[PDB]
């Protein structure tokens, strides 16, 4: 409530979906002014880059510049880019820097080793977040590195709590979190496209069908979050005997609806582990 | 509309959720709501009691109390309820049927036997009205004045999304957003089973699953982008997400959700026939 | 129609005179960028129908791969992967400074082409590409990657020549196996789909000719529509699907069969196999 | 020459047709008029932006037009015919675009008002917007040869167009009518496969779209059976025959057959209701 | 080769000049039982490739169905089921005593042909048959049933003529829908199977031409083997399946797919549909 990080300067290495979404969320929350944020990207023609520019974020094609501007430094690049970045700017890492890796599957140990060759005790945090931070409803976990100070973790939680749920986890849960909350929105966007197709099949106009399906999913998740009851208990509550809902639940069960989502989280988590190896 | 009194026939899950939403929105003092049911021992009735809603076993007390009257009963008991308080409808009443499948025409027919020009509105809503995030559609009957629709949309918008639709879409809406939250509750339970299988504590897995679906849905509502395009924005080449999407595709994920909506809508038609 | 290019100092050679050689030779000359007599092709079997078609076009034909190398500036290796090593050993001594060797084989890497040719001569100019037979109607899809000693002008020239018969862009070589899976095998997926759609039209009482014509016109127009649209394919799908209508009923039976999943499996199988065809 | 076109219905079809016609420069955007019962549609906004005259009144559209496209849902058609039937004049050519609705029923409704209505039934698709449509039509009892000739060359300006027997039109609807939607699904999924194997999304969409376009075109210009073209480019042991095999194992062919059949059967249902 | 028959007083007519007419005309003349100029065919579309092929053979062609009736003694109705009623009404008045009307349409019953023709003339001589296009290589499969007024000589003559281009036997009419399901649609099942087997050969590295040749030779020889064997097909299958060997592994994957069941479904679907094509 009126939170604001007076002297924090934030840098994004990578200027894609994730950098844009966090900068949008951070400035939406009012915890940072746009001009105290800087992002660098190898392609300065991404639509995400020009969106950042309209926000008032500082843009540069040199990762060195970003590192020099930043106190908190987000590595918002793909997993295989991380070693190319850590080697490019490892010499520029200074005392003050907190390096926050958002790359899937990439471990704190690997980041700390690459940076420790240039300089001892880099302050490293690993996190998994998602793009819904752009509407301030992200899901974020983080794990603190060996040399992260106690304040570094509390700082980063306070920053990331401003754009959604945020908590600390042991690092060895992050791969699984990537499969649930990290890939989660994509499952929901697939689910929502299909629900709308169902509504359209039954005669709803597409605009209405998309709006209704998204509101229904939004309300159910808010309901569960605010409820002390089991998701199955809530389902039981709204399933009238003989009714329309229980008939529909039966055809979800006949196709193994539940096991598909389990398969999804599994496949994503397993792939995440492979990206590291 | 600050002197408006609301009544409920049927003090079940829907009445509680609407009443909690209405009071949480501040549109309605709890004591200006009255509810009635034949089972006055339910927890829903006890919970409405704590809220400060007025309760009674007499549907007549509810009708004479109320200005806007919600019929929150099961589709097969509507004709009894209509027959029971049909002589007690007054000119001032707006009668809002909530039941699945029951047509405006059938309600206007029974009510007409007692009094010309009954003002009837049909709606399909859902239980997330209880955290003011419901999905609601409504259709106006023959004698519903335009002001009755504005009032209805104003009331129901305070507890979530609300739009007027033609009546012949409501069966389909039922299958989509009426039954929808139960689909999502199933999704979240299974997604949490997935997190647990991969090593997450159950509490953390429920939390992240719910937050992920909440954020995705909200993100789509604030976006000018098609949901497939958001899917595309967040799927890195060769990455974890596109791998998981492939296994969803292989089990026909999309078609099960189409199957669900279809089956709920089709069942909703059989409930009125 | 034509492309307003003309490579007036360019002699082109094809080693291999099968489907790909004839498609490219037909496309180039149809585009007007090359005259057929500046093209020479060679094959081990000179009775192939493709070789006769090349003779009708006026392309130069020879049984000897050395004659093609000596004739040509740009040299297309349009032979199967397992035959590339025998080709490179046969003609590696005849490569000269002017030659740009454009390998069309699936999965054969730049590294291994350069390694085989460098035993005869250092710094070979090598380009790897993946194209498809619709170049024969100037609607190919082509990607390329430049080798270690390819000059800047080499890739710009190859993109000029290949853009005249379809879409063409440069990629990193590590994407070509996956492109092979997608646009390299793409048309075979399409031919399968067009035959099945026509079968469906015939099942519903359409004559075969009409069903084939309409199915092809539908895919052509859909594909062109997406190419020129600013919208996601899902939004264009949505525009066609009238609520409660005929299209959405059909789409549901596609989804019930995991239609999307089969197309993903297909791109994945072709790509994975392409990787095996070098290792 | 002085031809005026009207659309009853201002949905997706009327917009692609109007966009197609003006792209061809067959007639000015302002010589087109569209009427819709909903003027808040994005299609009505889009038509408005390209310069087509809009009206909420079907009678205006009728009195504007010389060729009158009926582009509303099949079940709206008998209502339209009763509304504008007295306003049909001798000059009009009425072109029904609705799925399933037979020439015989349109001629019957309109006959109550004036003898010898000129009716034409057609099925087209949205690729008319890029002048690559697929269009069949049958002429009714009173269409003169000139009416069919004018029809053929108006629709040939925005893609393929041929005259067929009316009893083929339900089947055509399942094939080229719904066809682009099948293609769009195919192209989204192909792109997903490309992205799964490491391709950027934008490039994968582009290559997959280019491959369908090239293959369709090659087939149209070929004297070969598409199975022969398949075999021409399926190298023994190679990547394509491997990929073809996984298509076959899923019954790929049969799904597309089910799709044409499903759409065709639905088209017949639409007229029955 | 030839058949030692010659129907020297027989003029044959085909109403319809499509696949079946040309297959039969080619078979008959190849068998030597008829000269091409004693055959006349008529069609509504005289640009069909089948009509041009008939003109090469030397068959007589006419646009008028009446000219075919007047020319012919044996009159084949080689037209689609829904067109039979229009044919019979068009030429029913021109039927004479000498005519044997041989209907080839799927599902059209003798009763309904006799009923339609008897309005013009009592006691029409009608034969219903179901044959297939392999008559073009003298390996057709044909069954027939004689109508109410067909003479004993009519069926004996039809069996002579049809036995010269393949197998032929008389059946009760109530079996013809099921025969249609089996040998009438049979070859289309075979063409599908031969294309897929060749696909399987190509997957395993065989060139397409060789794979198509070997697949066809395998089915040809298997079918001929069973025709000449006194053994159940299962016993011949057993003879090929070396214990632990390659064939039995393949057979298991066929069984795991319900291969047998698909072929039963196919005969059942064709037969059931054939029954709908009259009702
Ligand atoms: O299950 C039913 O029938 C109703 C409709 C939607 C909510 O509960
Ligand atoms: O798709 C991926 O691999 C990453 C992880 C989760 C979101 O984007
Ligand atoms: O979906 C429908 O019903 C119509 C016909 C084909 C295109 O949109
Ligand atoms: O089938 C193959 O292996 C190659 C891929 C593209 C053309 O032929
Ligand atoms: O079954 C086998 O292994 C052998 C080879 C093919 C025929 O029998
Ligand atoms: Cl190809
Ligand atoms: Cl046959």
- Which three-class secondary structure string do you get for A23-37? HHHHHHHCCCCHHHE
Q: How far apart are the first and last CA of chain E?
A: 41
SS3 for chain D is CCCCEEEECCCHHHHHHHHHHHHHCCCCHHHEEEECCCCCCHHHHHHHHHCCEEECCHHHHHHHCCEEEECCCCCCHHHHHHHHHHHCCCCCEEEECCCCCCHHHHHHHHHCCCCCCCEEEEECCHHHHHCCEEEEEEECCCCCHHHHHHHHHHHHCCEEEEECCHHHHHHHHHHHHCHHHHHHHHHHHHHHHHHHCCCCHHHHHHHHHHHHHHHHHHHHHCCCCHHHHHHHCCCCCCHHHHHHHHHHHCCHHHHHHHHHHHHHHHHHHHHHC
- Give the C-alpha distances (Å, rounded to integers) separating E186 from A170, D151, E130: 66, 43, 12
| Under 8 Å between Cβ of B44 and B106 | no
CB contact under 8 A, B237 and D201: yes
Q: Is D11 labeled as ligand-binding?
A: yes
Task: For B167, name the nearest residue in chain A, comparing CA atoms only.
Answer: A204
* Nearest CA-CA distance, residue C228 and chain D, Å: 8
CA-closest candidate to residue D16, choices D121, D135, D99: D135
Helix (H, G, I), strand (E, B) or coil at A72: strand
CA-closest candidate to residue B194, choices A178, A259, A174: A259
Distance CA(C91)–CA(E242), nearest Å, equals 48
Task: For C239, name the nearest residue in chain B, comparing CA atoms only.
Answer: B226
> Do A and E touch (≥3 CB pairs < 8 Å)?
no
How many C-beta atoms surround the C-beta of residue C237 within 10 A? 27
Q: How far apart are the first and last CA of chain B?
A: 36
Alpha carbons within 13 A on the beta-carbon side of C197: 34
The owner of tokens 């007692």 is: B114
* Nearest CA-CA distance, residue E201 and chain D, Å: 8
The H or E element containing residue E125 is: strand E125-130
**Which of 207-266 (B) contact C at CB < 8 A?**
225-229, 232, 246, 249-252, 254-255, 258-259, 262
The owner of tokens 């059938």 is: B106
Give the angle D154-D157-D161 at the CA atoms, nearest 5°. Answer: 75
Give the angle D63-D68-D70 at the CA atoms, nearest 5°. Answer: 120
Burial of C121 (0-12, 13-18, 19+ CB in 10 A): middle
The H or E element containing residue B257 is: helix B253-272
Q: Cβ contacts of residue C30 below 8 Å, gap of 6+? A: C2, C138, C165
Give the angle B42-B44-B49 at the CA atoms, nearest 5°. Answer: 100
Burial of B82 (0-12, 13-18, 19+ CB in 10 A): buried
Cβ of D105 less than 6 Å from ligand 4: no
Which of A193, A194, A201 has its CB closest to that of C249?
A: A201
Contacts 24+ apart (CB under 8 A), A245-250: A245/B178, A245/B179, A245/B182, A245/B264, A247/B263, A247/B264, A247/B266, A247/B267, A248/B175, A248/B179, A248/B182, A248/B183, A248/B259, A248/B260, A248/B261, A248/B263, A248/B264, A248/B267, A249/B182, A249/B183, A249/B186, A249/B260, A250/B263
Helix (H, G, I), strand (E, B) or coil at A140: strand
Interruption sites in chain B after residues (C→N beyond 2.5 Å): none
Torsion of CA E173, E176, E177, E182, to 10 degrees: 160
User: Computed from CA positions of residues B22, B24, B26, B28, in that sequence, does the dihedral angle turn out positive or negative?
Assistant: positive
Angle between helix B180-197 and B202-221 (nearest 10): 130
Q: Cβ contacts of residue A240 below 8 Å, gap of 6+? A: A246, B74
Total number of residues shown for chain A = 277
CB contact under 8 A, C188 and D230: yes
**A121 φ/ψ sector (left φ>0, alpha ψ -120 to 50, else beta):** left
Q: Residue D181 corresponds to which tokens in the numbers above?
A: 């939607």
Taking the centre of ligand 5 as the mean of its atom positions, its distance from the CA of residue E226, in whole angstroms, is 19
The H or E element containing residue A225 is: helix A206-225
Taking the centre of ligand 4 as the mean of its atom positions, its distance from the CA of residue B237, in whole angstroms, is 23
Distance CA(E168)–CA(E171), nearest Å, equals 10
How many C-beta atoms surround the C-beta of residue A277 within 10 A? 5
The H or E element containing residue E170 is: strand E166-170
Q: Where are the beta strands (DSSP E) in chain B?
A: 6-9, 33-36, 54-56, 68-71, 94-97, 119-124, 134-140, 160-164
Give the angle E128-E130-E136 at the CA atoms, nearest 5°. Answer: 125
Name the method of structure determination.
X-ray
Nearest ligand, measured from the Cα of B264: 1
Q: Cβ contacts of residue D115 below 8 Å, gap of 6+? A: none
| DSSP-derived secondary structure letter, A81 | G
Interruption sites in chain C after residues (C→N beyond 2.5 Å): none
| Pick among B228, B248, B254, B263 to test the C interface (most C CBs inside 10 A) | B254
How many C-beta atoms surround the C-beta of residue B109 within 10 A? 13
Q: Give chain C positions within 8 Å (CB) of D258.
A: 200, 250, 253-254, 257
Q: Cβ contacts of residue A6 below 8 Å, gap of 6+? A: none
The owner of tokens 């990207």 is: A41
Q: Cβ contacts of residue B50 below 8 Å, gap of 6+? A: none
Q: What is the largest CA-CA distance in chain A?
A: 68
Task: For B260, name the nearest residue in chain A, comparing CA atoms only.
Answer: A248
**Which of 140-199 (A) contact B at CB < 8 A?**
141, 164-165, 167, 169, 172-173, 175-199
Distance CA(B113)–CA(B22), nearest Å, equals 32
CB contact under 8 A, B246 and D195: no
Q: Looking at the DSSP assignment, which residues form a beta bridge with residue B73?
A: none
The H or E element containing residue A232 is: helix A231-237
Q: Could you give phi then psi for residue C100, rounded to 5 degrees?
A: -110, 115
Q: Which residue CA neighbors atom 1 of ligand 2 most closely?
A: B241
Distance CA(D44)–CA(A124), nearest Å, equals 54
The H or E element containing residue E238 is: helix E233-240
Distance CA(C215)–CA(D216), nearest Å, equals 8
CB contact under 8 A, D201 and B232: yes
Helix (H, G, I), strand (E, B) or coil at A246: helix
Torsion of CA E129, E132, E135, E136, to 10 degrees: 140
Helix (H, G, I), strand (E, B) or coil at E100: strand
CA-closest candidate to residue E218, choices C44, E230, E206: E206
Give the angle C158-C163-C167 at the CA atoms, nearest 5°. Answer: 125
| Under 8 Å between Cβ of C144 and C135 | no
Q: Could you give phi then psi for residue A82, rounded to 5 degrees?
A: -50, -50
Indicate the pairing of strand B134-140 with strand B119-124: antiparallel
Q: Residue B35 corresponds to which tokens in the numbers above?
A: 């509810």
Q: Residue D64 corresponds to which tokens in the numbers above?
A: 């504007």
How many C-beta atoms surround the C-beta of residue A236 within 10 A? 13
Give the angle C106-C109-C112 at the CA atoms, nearest 5°. Answer: 130
Taking the centre of ligand 4 as the mean of its atom positions, its distance from the CA of residue C2, in whole angstroms, is 28
Q: Is C205 labeled as ligand-binding?
A: no
Distance CA(C151)–CA(C148), nearest Å, equals 9
Cβ of A238 less than 6 Å from ligand 1: yes
Q: Residue C194 corresponds to which tokens in the numbers above?
A: 């067009």
DSSP code per residue over chain C: ---S---TT--EEEES-SHHHHHHHHHHHHHTSS-GGGEEEE-S-TT-HHHHHHHHHT-EEES-HHHHHHH-SEEEE-S-GGGHHHHHHHHGGG--TT-EEEE--SS--HHHHHHHHHTTSSS-EEEEEE--GGGGGT-EEEEEEE-SS--HHHHHHHHHHHHTTEEEEE--GGGHHHHIIIIITHHHHHHHHHHHHHHHHHHTT--HHHHHHHHHHHHHHHHHHHHH-SS-HHHHHHHH--TTSHHHHHHHHHHHTTHHHHHHHHHHHHHHHHHHTT-
Q: Residue B125 corresponds to which tokens in the numbers above?
A: 């809503």
Helix (H, G, I), strand (E, B) or coil at E62: strand
Q: Give chain A positions within 8 Å (CB) of B261.
A: 195, 198-199, 201-202, 248
How many C-beta atoms surround the C-beta of residue E197 within 10 A? 17
Q: Looking at the DSSP assignment, which residues form a beta bridge with residue D119?
A: D94
Q: Looking at the DSSP assignment, which residues form a beta bridge with residue D161?
A: D135
How many C-beta atoms surround the C-beta of residue E230 within 10 A? 5
Helix (H, G, I), strand (E, B) or coil at A8: coil
Q: How far apart are the first and last CA of chain A?
A: 42
| DSSP-derived secondary structure letter, A158 | H
Catalogue all structural domains in chain C, each as residue range(s) with its CATH number: 12-183 (3.40.50.720), 185-277 (1.10.3730.10)
How many C-beta atoms surround the C-beta of residue D131 within 10 A? 17
Distance CA(B226)–CA(B25), nearest Å, equals 31
Ligand 3, pocket residues at CB < 6 Å: C 240-242, 245-247; D 99, 173, 177-178
| Under 8 Å between Cβ of A264 and B194 | yes
| DSSP-derived secondary structure letter, E202 | H
Q: What is the largest CA-CA distance in chain D?
A: 68
User: Computed from CA positions of residues C75, C79, C80, C84, in that sequence, does the dihedral angle turn out positive or negative?
Assistant: negative
Distance CA(E12)–CA(E38), nearest Å, equals 6
Indicate the pairing of strand D133-139 with strand D119-123: antiparallel
**Which of 90-149 (B) contact C at CB < 8 A?**
none
Q: Looking at the DSSP assignment, which residues form a beta bridge with residue E39?
A: E12
CA-closest candidate to residue E145, choices E169, E171, E124, E120: E171
Distance CA(C207)–CA(B122), nearest Å, equals 49
Q: Where are the beta strands (DSSP E) in chain A?
A: 10-13, 37-40, 58-60, 72-75, 98-101, 123-128, 138-144, 164-168
| Pick among D235, D236, D252, D261 to test the E interface (most E CBs inside 10 A) | D236
Distance CA(E245)–CA(D90), nearest Å, equals 80
CA-closest candidate to residue B272, choices B73, B76, B70, B72: B76
CA-closest candidate to residue C261, choices D215, D255, A200: D255
Q: Looking at the DSSP assignment, which residues form a beta bridge with residue E166?
A: E140
Distance CA(D189)–CA(A266), nearest Å, equals 22
Closest ligand 3 atom to Cα of D177: 6
Helix (H, G, I), strand (E, B) or coil at A114: helix
The owner of tokens 């008998």 is: D78
| DSSP-derived secondary structure letter, E101 | E
Distance CA(D80)–CA(C195), nearest Å, equals 39
Indicate the pairing of strand C74-77 with strand A164-168: unpaired
Distance CA(C191)–CA(B51), nearest Å, equals 66
The owner of tokens 């301030």 is: A136
Alpha carbons within 13 A on the beta-carbon side of B190: 22
Q: Residue A17 corresponds to which tokens in the numbers above?
A: 């979906």
| DSSP-derived secondary structure letter, E23 | H
- Give the C-alpha distances (Å, rounded to integers) separating C20 from C78, C185, E22: 6, 13, 37
SS3 for B106-171 is HHHHHHHCCCCCCEEEEEECCHHHHHCCEEEEEEECCCCCHHHHHHHHHHHHCCEEEEECCHHHHH
Burial of A48 (0-12, 13-18, 19+ CB in 10 A): buried
Cβ of B178 less than 6 Å from ligand 1: yes
Helix (H, G, I), strand (E, B) or coil at E168: strand
How many C-beta atoms surround the C-beta of residue B239 within 10 A? 24
């Amino acid at each position: 409530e009126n939170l604001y990080f007076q002297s924090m300067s934030v840098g994004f290495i990578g200027a894609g979906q994730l950098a844009f979404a966090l900068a949008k969320g951070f400035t939406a929350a009012g915890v940072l002014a746009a001009h105290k944020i800087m992002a660098s990207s190898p392609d300065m023609d991404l639509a995400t880059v020009s969106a950042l520019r309209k926000m008032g974020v500082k843009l540069t094609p040199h990762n060195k510049e970003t590192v020099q501007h930043s106190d908190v430094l987000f590595l918002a690049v793909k997993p295989h880019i991380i070693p190319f970045i850590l080697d490019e700017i490892g010499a520029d890492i200074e005392d003050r820097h907190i390096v926050v890796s958002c790359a899937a599957g990439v471990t704190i140990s690997s980041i700390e080793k690459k940076l420790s060759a240039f300089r001892p005790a880099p302050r490293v945090i690993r996190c998994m977040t998602n793009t819904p931070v752009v509407v301030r409803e992200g899901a974020t976990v983080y794990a603190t590195g060996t040399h992260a100070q106690v304040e570094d973790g509390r700082l980063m939680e306070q920053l990331l709590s401003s754009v959604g749920f945020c908590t600390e986890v042991e690092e060895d849960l992050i791969d699984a979190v990537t499969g649930l909350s990290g890939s989660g929105p994509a499952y929901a966007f697939t689910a929502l496209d299909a629900l709308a197709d169902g509504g359209v099949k039954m005669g709803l106009p597409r605009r209405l069908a998309v709006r209704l399906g998204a509101q229904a999913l939004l309300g159910a998740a808010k309901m569960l979050l605010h409820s002390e009851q089991h998701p199955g208990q809530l389902k039981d509550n709204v399933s009238s005997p003989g009714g329309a809902t229980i008939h529909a639940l039966h055809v979800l069960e006949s196709g193994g609806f539940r096991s598909l989502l389990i398969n999804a989280v599994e496949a994503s988590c397993i792939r995440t582990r492979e990206l590291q190896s």
